[PDB]
């Protein structure tokens, strides 16, 4: 519950939050790995 | 295909070798011509 602060002469208001974690697999999979071996190939 | 590539990079490395930069030694020559060629076949 975020209230505003005091007027000398914004609302009161509820806030709910997600934090959020993003699960990688996808560009691990595509981007990652085949950078991984394409630094290998320079090698 | 990256495995191949290597294995492409060690059999060119393998094929221009000359007397001058490498040694042939004789137990990689027998094994190399002699075993092998009559193993894989
Ligand atoms: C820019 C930052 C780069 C991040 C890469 C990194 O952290 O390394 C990655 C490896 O390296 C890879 O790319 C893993 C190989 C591909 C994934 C295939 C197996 C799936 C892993 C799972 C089946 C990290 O991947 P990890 O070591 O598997 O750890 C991740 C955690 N996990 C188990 C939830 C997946």
Known sequence: LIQPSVDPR??????????????????????????????LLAI | VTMVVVICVIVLNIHFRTPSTHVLSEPVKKLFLETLPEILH
């Open chain 1, 10 to 39: 914004r609302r009161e208001e509820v806030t709910f939050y997600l934090i959020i974690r993003r699960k990688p697999l996808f560009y691990l999979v595509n981007v990652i790995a085949p950078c991984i071996l394409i630094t």
